Structures are given as structure tokens and as C-alpha cells.
Design an enzyme around this catalytic site. Structure first.
Site, PDB file in Angstrom:
ATOM      1  N   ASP A 135       0.885  -1.359   0.365  1.00  0.00           N
ATOM      2  CA  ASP A 135      -0.043  -0.142   0.030  1.00  0.00           C
ATOM      3  C   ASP A 135       0.623   1.508   0.398  1.00  0.00           C
ATOM      4  OD1 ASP A 135      -2.917   1.740  -0.285  1.00  0.00           O
ATOM      5  OD2 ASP A 135      -2.310   1.753   2.177  1.00  0.00           O
ATOM      6  N   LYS A 137       2.291   4.773  -1.115  1.00  0.00           N
ATOM      7  CA  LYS A 137       1.994   5.667  -2.004  1.00  0.00           C
ATOM      8  C   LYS A 137       2.610   6.969  -1.089  1.00  0.00           C
ATOM      9  CE  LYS A 137      -2.393   4.684   1.231  1.00  0.00           C
ATOM     10  NZ  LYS A 137      -3.260   4.935   1.846  1.00  0.00           N
ATOM     11  N   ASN A 140       2.165   7.553   2.872  1.00  0.00           N
ATOM     12  CA  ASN A 140       2.420   6.615   3.924  1.00  0.00           C
ATOM     13  C   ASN A 140       4.205   6.601   3.554  1.00  0.00           C
ATOM     14  OD1 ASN A 140       3.169   4.875   1.799  1.00  0.00           O
ATOM     15  ND2 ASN A 140       1.144   3.525   2.920  1.00  0.00           N
ATOM     16  N   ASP A 153       2.747   2.517   7.576  1.00  0.00           N
ATOM     17  CA  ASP A 153       1.690   1.979   7.730  1.00  0.00           C
ATOM     18  C   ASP A 153       2.361   0.613   7.538  1.00  0.00           C
ATOM     19  OD1 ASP A 153      -0.986   0.888   6.503  1.00  0.00           O
ATOM     20  OD2 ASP A 153      -1.118   3.279   4.825  1.00  0.00           O
ATOM     21  N   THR A 166      -4.613   1.298  -1.940  1.00  0.00           N
ATOM     22  CA  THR A 166      -5.339   2.528  -2.111  1.00  0.00           C
ATOM     23  C   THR A 166      -5.343   2.423  -3.959  1.00  0.00           C
ATOM     24  OG1 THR A 166      -4.148   4.263   0.019  1.00  0.00           O
ATOM     25  CG2 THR A 166      -5.272   4.965  -2.180  1.00  0.00           C
TER      26      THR A 166
HETATM   27  C1  LIG Z   1      -2.800   5.977   7.835  1.00  0.00           C
HETATM   28  C2  LIG Z   1      -2.832   5.792   9.427  1.00  0.00           C
HETATM   29  C3  LIG Z   1      -4.082   5.955  10.150  1.00  0.00           C
HETATM   30  C4  LIG Z   1      -5.204   4.160   9.082  1.00  0.00           C
HETATM   31  C5  LIG Z   1      -3.263   3.992   9.652  1.00  0.00           C
HETATM   32  N1  LIG Z   1      -4.015   1.924   9.644  1.00  0.00           N
HETATM   33  C6  LIG Z   1      -3.956   0.794  10.552  1.00  0.00           C
HETATM   34  O1  LIG Z   1      -3.792   0.541  11.561  1.00  0.00           O
HETATM   35  O2  LIG Z   1      -4.670  -0.154  10.211  1.00  0.00           O
HETATM   36  C7  LIG Z   1      -4.367  -1.457  11.287  1.00  0.00           C
HETATM   37  C8  LIG Z   1      -5.857  -2.537  10.031  1.00  0.00           C
HETATM   38  C9  LIG Z   1      -5.345  -0.796  12.566  1.00  0.00           C
HETATM   39  C10 LIG Z   1      -3.684  -2.063  11.359  1.00  0.00           C
HETATM   40  C11 LIG Z   1      -2.052   3.625   9.156  1.00  0.00           C
HETATM   41  N2  LIG Z   1      -2.203   5.133   9.322  1.00  0.00           N
HETATM   42  C12 LIG Z   1      -0.865   5.213  10.141  1.00  0.00           C
HETATM   43  C13 LIG Z   1      -0.087   6.351  10.298  1.00  0.00           C
HETATM   44  C14 LIG Z   1       1.042   6.212  10.847  1.00  0.00           C
HETATM   45  C15 LIG Z   1       2.320   7.651  11.160  1.00  0.00           C
HETATM   46  C16 LIG Z   1       1.395   8.646  10.134  1.00  0.00           C
HETATM   47  C17 LIG Z   1       1.407   9.746  10.723  1.00  0.00           C
HETATM   48  C18 LIG Z   1       2.932  10.423  11.400  1.00  0.00           C
HETATM   49  C19 LIG Z   1       3.717  11.196  11.687  1.00  0.00           C
HETATM   50  N3  LIG Z   1       3.797  11.996  11.666  1.00  0.00           N
HETATM   51  N4  LIG Z   1       4.873  10.574  12.489  1.00  0.00           N
HETATM   52  N5  LIG Z   1       5.384   9.409  12.516  1.00  0.00           N
HETATM   53  C20 LIG Z   1       4.020   9.080  11.901  1.00  0.00           C
HETATM   54  C21 LIG Z   1       3.277   7.874  11.647  1.00  0.00           C
HETATM   55  N6  LIG Z   1       1.784   5.168  11.132  1.00  0.00           N
HETATM   56  C22 LIG Z   1       1.657   4.483  10.753  1.00  0.00           C
HETATM   57  N7  LIG Z   1       2.293   2.939  10.919  1.00  0.00           N
HETATM   58  N8  LIG Z   1       0.286   3.933  10.633  1.00  0.00           N
END
Ligand SMILES: C[C@H]1CC[C@@H](NC(=O)OC(C)(C)C)CN1c1cc(-c2ccc3c(N)[nH]nc3c2)nc(N)n1
Length: 279
Positions: A135, A137, A140, A153, A166
Site C-alpha cells: 500500500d 503511496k 505513507n 503503515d 489505495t
Molecule cells: C494511515 C494511518 C491511520 C490508519 C492506520 N491503519 C491501521 O492501523 O490499520 C490497521 C488495520 C488498524 C492496522 C495506518 N496509519 C498509520 C499512520 C502512521 C503515521 C502517521 C503520521 C506520522 C507522523 N507524523 N510521524 N509518524 C507517523 C506515523 N504510521 C502507521 N504505522 N500507520
């Protein structure tokens, strides 16, 4: 060896929301004892269980623990309370690459080359560990305070030894076979390079269905203002046959990709030590 004791919510001062999904929220937090900032991802157990997301949460924790490379957001710690799981992640202060594309419109060749090279170098590392992002993009691919990338992500990642990403970056094989490989990430890379240069993703349409229709037909085109060597590179990544994308195993991997004329002036050995071009 003895590690530090588990952290807990009271060890932090929480601040603004950094990102949001239907199953989790990422919140900026400052650790009180150290004044360190982390992006803490908060997941409500009940909702995760209720919607069968346990395998994805587990996958992200496992993947993000195993990675040890500067171009990836790191998982530093986890803890939970009665209702919630908390993942302490690297805080990338400058946020999403998408923000910069929107802000400046499109990147000049120097910036396109540098950031593309960082993304290629990150994928080489990831794929070398038998992990596919699935995924990838500009949302992320984050930017740290120093303006180097940090990819995040990973819940949807696949570990080599079901899910469609996406719409704009989905590879044809996912639409025609339901089967992802390292090469699916290289397709996304091609889309991202295109977007850096053109300012927009190559497959665009009024809804998801029409986007997918364009993808399987390889229906896109280049603007006149597109760096010729970048265009050649994109044409070697956006290939329907996954075994024919530059960088994939059947094309003999990252050597020929990094050797592409678009990357002529790149020093691949120490990109993280280099100073990024001003956007
Ligand atoms: C897009 C965002 C929300 C949905 C989420 N989706 C999820 O958890 O899906 C599950 C099924 C529950 C596993 C994936 N998410 C992220 C977001 C970030 C992130 C974002 C901003 C950051 C910053 N400014 N510094 N660091 C950061 C790390 N990091 C990870 N790893 N994920």
C-alpha cells in the site's frame, strides 16, 4: 538483557492528532521523562476484534519491530490499558510527502531524483527482507525533521516465505488475479515517480471502478513537461506483466534499476547522510 520497563499512558503528554483511520488514530506525544516526541498509534481492542483486524495489527507490530533502517518509521515500544493498544512510532515532523506535492505542485528534476532514489533504496532494503508493502503511496511516505523519508503503515504488508491497496496505486495483478509480489511495490513506485513529476497520479478517474478500468488497460499518458529520463524509467515500471518491471527478481533486481540513466548522478551508498535538495 534487561530492557526498560513498560511505558504507560501517564508517561506521556498527548498532543495533536497526526493521522486517522477507522480503526486507529496516531497522536503526537511527548515522553515526560525524556522530552522525546513519538507518534503514538492508539488502537481500540474491541473495535479491532469486532472487525477482524487482529492479523493486520499483529502484522504491523511484527514488521515494524524487525525493520532497522533510517528510511522506515521505527516501532520503539508497545503497551496497553484496558481498552487500548499503543504503538510508539518514530515521529516524522514534516508529515506526508503528499503534502509537499500539493504545496509545491510538482518536483523539479533534482528533487524528483533524490526522493525517488531514497524510495528505491528503502524498497531494496524492505524487499531484501522478504517483505512487500502493498500500500505504498505518498500518504505513507513521511518526511522527517531533516527532510529524509520515513515510510510507515505496515498493517497491510505481506511477508514472504486478500487486500487491495489505495485505488490510484493498485497494480494490475491485484485486479486480475488477487496476487501481490515485490513487483506490486515497483508498480506503486512508478505511479509515485509520475506523481512527483506531473503533480498528479497517472491513473485518475471519477470513481474507483473507472480507475481500475484504466489500470488494467494501462491507460495513461505523460504530459509534455516530463523529464525524458524519468519518463523512460516510469515506462519500465508501469508494465502490465509484473515479471517485466525494472527492479523485480525476473529483471535481476535492484542493480539494473539503480543503474537506470535517470539515476546517473546518484550516490546510493549513503543517501541518508546526504543533504536533501530544497523543495
Ligand atoms: C494511515 C494511518 C491511520 C490508519 C492506520 N491503519 C491501521 O492501523 O490499520 C490497521 C488495520 C488498524 C492496522 C495506518 N496509519 C498509520 C499512520 C502512521 C503515521 C502517521 C503520521 C506520522 C507522523 N507524523 N510521524 N509518524 C507517523 C506515523 N504510521 C502507521 N504505522 N500507520
Amino acid at each position: 538483557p534487561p530492557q526498560p520497563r513498560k511505558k504507560r499512558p501517564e508517561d506521556f503528554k498527548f498532543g495533536k492528532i497526526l493521522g486517522e483511520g477507522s480503526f486507529s488514530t496516531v497522536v503526537l506525544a511527548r515522553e515526560l521523562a525524556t522530552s522525546r516526541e513519538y507518534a503514538i498509534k492508539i488502537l481500540e481492542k474491541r473495535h479491532i476484534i469486532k472487525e477482524n483486524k487482529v492479523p493486520y495489527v499483529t502484522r504491523e507490530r511484527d514488521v515494524m519491530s524487525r525493520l532497522d533502517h533510517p528510511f522506515f518509521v521505527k516501532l520503539y515500544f508497545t503497551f496497553q490499558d484496558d481498552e487500548k493498544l499503543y504503538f510508539g512510532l518514530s515521529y516524522a515532523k514534516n508529515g506526508e510527502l503528499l503534502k509537499y506535492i500539493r504545496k509545491i505542485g510538482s518536483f523539479d528534476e533534482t528533487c524528483t531524483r533524490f526522493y525517488t532514489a531514497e524510495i528505491v533504496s528503502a524498497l531494496e532494503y524492505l524487499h531484501g527482507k522478504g517483505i512487500i508493502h502493498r500500500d505504498l503511496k505518498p500518504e505513507n511516505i513521511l518526511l522527517n525533521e531533516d527532510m529524509h523519508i520515513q515510510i510507515t503503515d505496515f498493517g497491510t504488508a505481506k511477508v514472504l516465505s486478500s487486500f487491495v491497496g489505495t485505488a490510484q496505486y493498485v497494480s494490475p495483478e491485484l485486479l486480475t488475479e488477487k496476487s501481490a509480489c515485490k513487483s506490486s511495490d515497483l508498480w506503486a513506485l512508478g505511479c509515485i515517480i509520475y506523481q512527483l513529476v506531473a503533480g498528479l497520479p497517472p491513473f485518475r478517474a471519477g470513481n474507483e471502478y473507472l480507475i481500475f478500468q484504466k489500470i488494467i488497460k494501462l491507460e495513461y499518458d505523460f504530459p509534455e513537461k516530463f523529464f525524458p529520463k524519468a519518463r523512460d524509467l516510469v515506462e519500465k515500471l508501469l508494465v502490465l506483466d509484473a515479471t517485466k518491471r525494472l527492479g523485480c527478481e525476473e529483471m535481476e533486481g535492484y542493480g539494473p534499476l539503480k543503474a537506470h540513466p535517470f539515476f546517473e548522478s546518484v550516490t546510493w551508498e549513503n543517501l541518508h547522510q546526504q543533504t536533501p535538495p530544497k523543495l
